[PDB]
Design a protein around this ligand. Structure first.
Ligand SMILES: C[C@@H]1O[C@@H](O[C@H]2[C@H](O[C@@H]3[C@@H](O)[C@H](O)CO[C@@H]3O)O[C@H](CO)[C@H](O)[C@@H]2O)[C@@H](O)[C@H](O)[C@@H]1O
Ligand SMILES: C[C@@H]1O[C@@H](O[C@H]2[C@H](O[C@@H]3[C@@H](O)[C@H](O)CO[C@@H]3O)O[C@H](CO)[C@H](O)[C@@H]2O)[C@@H](O)[C@H](O)[C@@H]1O
Ligand SMILES: C[C@@H]1O[C@@H](O[C@H]2[C@H](O[C@@H]3[C@@H](O)[C@H](O)CO[C@@H]3O)O[C@H](CO)[C@H](O)[C@@H]2O)[C@@H](O)[C@H](O)[C@@H]1O
Ligand code: FUC
Ligand code: FUC
Ligand code: FUC
Lengths: 88, 89, 89
């Protein structure tokens, strides 16, 4: 068995976010040009994927966290992480 | 066990496509700014990844669907999904 | 069981790189507009993800290769692949 990761990046610095599903929990490591740090994202899941887009200089991120057949969408728009009503 | 997903997005609306491998079948959920809907993509696979690029406002998508060691490339270019001749190795 | 892939792309040609974890080894298939070929990337891993960004016309790629709880970051910036000091948590 191994952990399962997902990655996204933006700009040219770059900024990078790496998500890791490990024993039913997803955590986040972050690079903004000056070291890797532990990010605010921490939610349940056995599987993770991610996508992101910029609106001007502001990053928007969607993290799809799945356990069993249930997928939860987590949303970042600059002010914290919230789960949406997204339902597979 | 759990399902396995892959996601891609484009533009600033944005549009998002989320692919889910579940019991050997990959399906697709779609967002173009006005609700989530079930997409046209439905193909066999135990594993899925995706990438996409824009040419102007036209989206192009490649979905890599795997079973065993066999990886099949599915292509969207505005007018349906088609399997390419892509092979692993 | 099945292989596990990750994909990235850039520009409008486009270029595409597909990474596959297969029996503890990750390999790479490449498209630059003129056929699929086996890429330089070949490293151990049971799981792979990837991201890339352009700086002008130069592609930069990070591949995250995991075995157990150990994740290795492999870096391409035009001159070959090297591992960084990236350590999970
Ligand atoms: C996208 C977001 O990134 C981190 O959020 C932290 C936020 O970090 C960033 C900032 O340092 C960077 O240079 C550019 O933008 C980002 O938003 O910074 C604030 C403090 O200003 C907090 O530390 C945020 O946690 C992650 O922690 C988030 O989970 C998310 O990935
Ligand atoms: C990329 C494509 O998206 C869906 O295709 C549907 C298509 O949707 C899109 C459109 O509504 C959007 O605003 C921009 O581009 C797309 O083409 O719209 C037609 C009706 O106009 C059908 O609904 C298509 O199914 C998915 O269903 C496809 O699988 C694919 O992801
Ligand atoms: C990004 C890189 O791509 C391959 O590297 C090969 C390199 O390929 C590219 C070139 O042919 C293309 O038109 C645009 O840029 C790329 O860098 O070409 C050199 C010799 O010219 C070698 O063939 C490199 O191997 C992969 O092999 C790398 O692993 C990586 O994905
Ligand atoms: C881009 C969209 O952002 C919000 O409206 C979310 O609630 C949606 O589920 C989608 O991710
Ligand atoms: C970008 C390229 O598009 C088509 O030519 C496909 O047949 C290739 O396999 C590749 O995806
Ligand atoms: C963008 C950064 O590039 C190098 O500095 C690496 O050592 C980092 O881990 C990161 O990927």
């Amino acid at each position: 068995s191994s952990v399962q990761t997902a990655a996204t990046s933006w700009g040219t610095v770059p900024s990078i976010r790496v998500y890791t599903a490990n024993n039913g929990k997803i955590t986040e490591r972050c690079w903004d040009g000056k070291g890797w740090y532990t990010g605010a994202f921490n939610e349940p899941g056995d599987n993770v994927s991610v996508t992101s887009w910029l609106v001007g200089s502001a990053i928007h991120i969607r993290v799809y966290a799945s356990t069993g057949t249930t997928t939860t969408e987590w949303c970042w728009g600059g002010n914290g992480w919230t789960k949406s009503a997204y339902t597979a």
